[PDB]
């Protein structure tokens, strides 16, 4: 399992958890930014200093609110990730 193909399938978990409309959106464009920022690896391979580096070019930018949130969306998909078995622990953390 690798990074994009497990974000297609957390974008369908999304669709499922019956979040309001404004909220998805949002959800959906921060995992766009995350397939734009991270490589097609496998979850193991996703290192520290790769997630880092995304989310200090937000940060450098003063873009403290889209840092945030996308550092979140990227955490709750690799708990579903655990959840469905492909890697045991959360590396965003």
Same mark, same amino acid.
């Given at each position: =399992?690798?990074?994009?193909?497990?974000?297609?399938?957390? @974008?369908?978990?999304?669709?499922?958890?019956?979040?309001?409309?404004?909220?998805? +959106?949002?959800? =959906?464009?921060?995992?766009?930014?995350?397939?734009?920022?991270?490589?097609?690896?496998?979850?193991?391979?996703?290192?520290?200093? @790769?997630?880092?580096? =995304?989310?200090?070019?937000? +940060?450098? @930018?003063?873009?403290?609110?889209?840092?945030?949130?996308?550092?979140?969306?990227?955490?709750?998909?690799?708990? @579903?990730? +655990?959840?469905?078995?492909?890697?045991?622990?959360?590396?965003?953390?």
């Amino acid at each position: =399992m690798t990074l994009h193909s497990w974000l297609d399938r957390y @974008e369908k978990i999304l669709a499922s958890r019956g979040i309001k409309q404004k909220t998805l +959106i949002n959800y =959906m464009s921060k995992i766009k930014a995350i397939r734009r920022g991270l490589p097609d690896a496998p979850l193991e391979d996703i290192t520290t200093k @790769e997630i880092a580096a =995304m989310l200090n070019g937000y +940060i450098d @930018e003063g873009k403290a609110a889209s840092a945030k949130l996308i550092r979140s969306t990227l955490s709750d998909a690799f708990r @579903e990730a +655990i959840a469905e078995g492909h890697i045991t622990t959360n590396h965003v953390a």
